[PDB]
């Protein structure tokens, strides 16, 4: 895995909306209203450990406000677009 911080622009905010949408299906935290994704947002790029030295997927680690509480959500993304999954959604957590 390799790590980088990405901005919290539209792509990142939409990851946050996805996370909230998916958590609403579960219902652990009742019915949440997405507010906004705040810094820092981390992107993990996952590589196959042997040649051809290749990317097998991504994971995003977000701090997202929903219904005015702060949550940590981890989201996986496949190489073939449109395979996103909510891995973890935990909180409330203290601010970064």
Numbering used by the authors: 2 to 97
From the primary publication:
Here, we engineer the hydrophobic QVVAG hinge loop from the domain-swapping cystatin, stefin B, individually into the β-turn-β motifs of the single chain variant of the sweet protein monellin (MNEI). In domain swapping, two protein molecules exchange “domains” or structural units connected by a hinge loop, such that intermolecular interactions replace the intramolecular interactions at the dimer interface of each monomer. We show that introducing the QVVAG motif into three different surface loops of MNEI results in domain-swapped dimerization, generating topologically-distinct domain-swapped dimers of MNEI. We then show that engineering the QVVAG stretch simultaneously into two different loops of MNEI creates two swappable domains in it, resulting in the formation of a double domain-swapped dimer.
